[PDB]
Design a protein around this ligand. Sequence first.
Ligand SMILES: *C(=N)[C@H](C[C@@H]1CCNC1=O)NC(=O)[C@H](CC1CCCCC1)NC(=O)[C@@H](NC(=O)OCc1ccccc1)[C@@H](C)OC(C)(C)C
Ligand SMILES: *C(=N)[C@H](C[C@@H]1CCNC1=O)NC(=O)[C@H](CC1CCCCC1)NC(=O)[C@@H](NC(=O)OCc1ccccc1)[C@@H](C)OC(C)(C)C
Lengths: 306, 306
Amino acid sequence: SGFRKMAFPSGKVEGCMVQVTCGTTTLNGLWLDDVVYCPRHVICTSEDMLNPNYEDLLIRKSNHNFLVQAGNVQLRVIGHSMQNCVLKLKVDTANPKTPKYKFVRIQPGQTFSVLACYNGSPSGVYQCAMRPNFTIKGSFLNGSCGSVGFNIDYDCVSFCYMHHMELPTGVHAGTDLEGNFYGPFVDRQTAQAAGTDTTITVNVLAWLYAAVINGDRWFLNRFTTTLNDFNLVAMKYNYEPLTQDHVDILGPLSAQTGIAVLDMCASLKELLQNGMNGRTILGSALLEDEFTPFDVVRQCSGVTFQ
Amino acid sequence: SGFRKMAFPSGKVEGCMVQVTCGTTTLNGLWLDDVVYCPRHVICTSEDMLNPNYEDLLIRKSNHNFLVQAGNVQLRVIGHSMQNCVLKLKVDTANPKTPKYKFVRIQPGQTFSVLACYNGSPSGVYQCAMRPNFTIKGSFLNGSCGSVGFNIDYDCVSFCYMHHMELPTGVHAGTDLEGNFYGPFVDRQTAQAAGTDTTITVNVLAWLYAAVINGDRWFLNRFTTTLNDFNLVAMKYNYEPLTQDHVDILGPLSAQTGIAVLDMCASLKELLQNGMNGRTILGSALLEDEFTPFDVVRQCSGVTFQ
Ligand SMILES: *C(=N)[C@H](C[C@@H]1CCNC1=O)NC(=O)[C@H](CC1CCCCC1)NC(=O)[C@@H](NC(=O)OCc1ccccc1)[C@@H](C)OC(C)(C)C
Ligand SMILES: *C(=N)[C@H](C[C@@H]1CCNC1=O)NC(=O)[C@H](CC1CCCCC1)NC(=O)[C@@H](NC(=O)OCc1ccccc1)[C@@H](C)OC(C)(C)C
């Protein structure tokens, strides 16, 4: 028993991190087979950031302008290309530590582990969710760009996030590994802001199921609710609407605990209406929304990875 | 910016995990050089657990009774010995992925990352503290024994914890890597209980410094307090006493923020007296005590590891 913010083991990704240096800018890159992926604003200078035209900027670069360091080893760039907001540097050496991997673009609400890096060197790993406003509440300092977010399924690494920028409220924006930003953000230093966020309802419900699996039942009640009446209360508290698809996904957790999904909804409704009244759930005094139904089942049942 | 429960990258430890099978019992072991470390209750059977005499039990075992699996590879045991509550299986092959490492026994209050494993396969990584009552609030299911807790300093892995048992309140007990339990617990299935826990004062203060580094100042006040008067209020709220050593350790964080340690204490005093009044600190509605002063500096300044 117990329940923790659990990240995936990071070793398969650690063996892919490298340093990419161009001009006066150093950041991280991801080395898979003979290609190194990194944010295209590495080719920007301190005066290009305002409204850069990356196509102009890139046609002006030579291969030898890109300095790629993998440990104590320099890789030579033999080609480059831009795909949306990511730069792809072809190098003459295939990374022998390349895991099995996919690139996937995730939906708001899904979670992933972030391996935070500086100068191609991993610093720490933590669990994140893509927020409904397509930011992530990360932990990132200067030089962290090019750090990736990821999931693992058995032996396959599904990369879903590369870090690009911090927004004025201290939250973070980035792209999938094909260079498409999550959300309306763009990689130029112009006024942008996160947009109003909401709480991921389906995830709060899964975490309440986790609490029941772990012995916390104080928040349950005998009541039930309809989906309509639940969603009417959720809107008032700035919660994402719950759909029938969400209900269906919460099926396995419902059947294992014996608490119908709509009954757990009735319970969350009273938690929103009455607060927690100085009590905690799974060590939290807040309703936690960064565990998906899959995260709960994974941790409360013990799925491993090779 | 941002602040997260950050674990160390786990790859150096992933390459050391193996499966150890003896009779009807499977658990995890730690393979460093030509030795595999694992909990000695692997040699117990379902009827030995009540009051086992491990010396009796072990002299009755042969090397070929221990089945050690490293991936798709069986290792042959060529010797065994018991050191306190850990079993050391000498195998004929040195682990080529052995990182630089130390074994260290930590003090209550120190934090570490846990790589949770089943059947020698890593499942997830998360950050823990050793609680003042020498338990850890882990996340552990059947088969998780032999999972280790660890810190990393540049390139060196300091192993500090191996998992052995869960206690009736759902918290966890284990040993250092030389087999000495943290706390008064023993590895026999007899009535044991955690003992009264306290909040790690020095860590709460460090986390309040983290919040100031990240832009939260709403909890500060103009007041100050003496150490004596602070400790008188801490005892009342079941907080560990703060010593001058603690004050000294909080020096760097004091100097970087410009908030004297005793002023931050005055702030924590009013937080304990008045609660947080529906506000949050670093996304938490509770006073968080599982970050050390070192954790804060590491994450708010970006220390990496090779
Ligand atoms: C990458 N290594 C770096 C990571 C940042 C640094 C601190 N935390 C992080 O996550 N990324 C940047 O520093 C990045 C440089 C790029 C961004 C794209 C365009 C080319 C330069 N800059 C930022 O993240 C800045 N954010 C930003 O410009 O957002 C748009 C904006 C501009 C003006 C006013 C409001 C919003 C950060 C560093 O700047 C602030 C917002 C002050 C943190
Ligand atoms: C290892 N793989 C396993 C990990 C546990 C399982 C669930 N979560 C975990 O962390 N360890 C055990 O299952 C372990 C077996 C050993 C323990 C030492 C002696 C030889 C057998 N057992 C336990 O962790 C049990 N705890 C326990 O016995 O504590 C002492 C006790 C005994 C009776 C009454 C109160 C306290 C667990 C599995 O049992 C309970 C407490 C019911 C969870």
